[PDB]
């Protein structure tokens, strides 16, 4: 058993899981799509940058 | 006669015109001044481009 802490835990528990060898056999999928595309800009009224 | 169609025609008609050899001699003038200067930008509120 790989024991991962849950550092933020409101009560107490343990969740005994499963992870197969595949990334297909999981039980939940985190599927990224686009990752942190940074945007920039500035508003010409005050000329002070936003991001 | 140079017979041009008017492809958007409400009732029907023919307009017999004139165009001289000059482009000074017409009866109406389409005078361009600037042409489709494209403009771009993005509003820093929502960061989504406008054109």
Distance from CA of B13 to the nearest CA of A (A): 53
Distance from CA of A21 to the nearest CA of B (A): 41
Measured between alpha carbons, how far is A2 from B29 in angstroms, rounded to an integer? 82
Measured between alpha carbons, how far is B14 from B33 in angstroms, rounded to an integer? 31
DSSP class of residue B45 equals: T
DSSP state string for B5-30: --SS-SS---------SSSSSSSS--
Non-local CB neighbours of A48 within 8 Å, separated by 6+ positions? A42
Give CA angle at A26 (A20, A32), nearest 5°: 125
Could you write out the three-class secondary structure of A16-43?
Answer: CCCCCCCCCCCCCCCCCCCCCCCCCEEE
Interface of B with A in 21-50 (CB under 8 A): 42-45, 47
Residue of A34, A41, A42, A48 to mutate when probing chain B, most B C-beta within 10 A: A41
């Amino acid at each position: 058993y790989r024991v991962y802490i849950d550092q933020y835990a409101k009560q107490d528990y343990f969740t005994v899981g499963y992870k197969g060898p595949n990334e297909m056999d999981a039980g939940i999928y985190y599927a990224p799509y686009v990752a942190l595309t940074p945007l920039r800009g500035s508003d010409p009224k005050n000329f002070q940058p936003v991001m």
